[PDB]
Amino acid sequence: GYIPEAPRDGQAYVRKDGEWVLLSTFL
Amino acid sequence: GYIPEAPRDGQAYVRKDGEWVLLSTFL
Amino acid sequence: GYIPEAPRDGQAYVRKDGEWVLLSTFL
């Protein structure tokens, strides 16, 4: 389906496993 | 709600603050 | 329009060119 909004919290998110995961996880 | 399309412009985007932000911002 | 789900496969994706592209492409 379509993807719901990510957290709105001053952090960047990427799409993984049908979820929003912090970009910083990967950096 | 659901998220609208990001710019279609040859650049990658991540989701932040209910917006599409260039990935390159963080790299 | 709204964006469809990314692959659900243990990898992170970013939005580019109206598509889901592996984050690892850029790292």
From TrEMBL, chains A, B, C:
It comes from the Viruses. This is Fibritin. The lineage of its organism: Viruses, Duplodnaviria, Heunggongvirae, Uroviricota, Caudoviricetes.
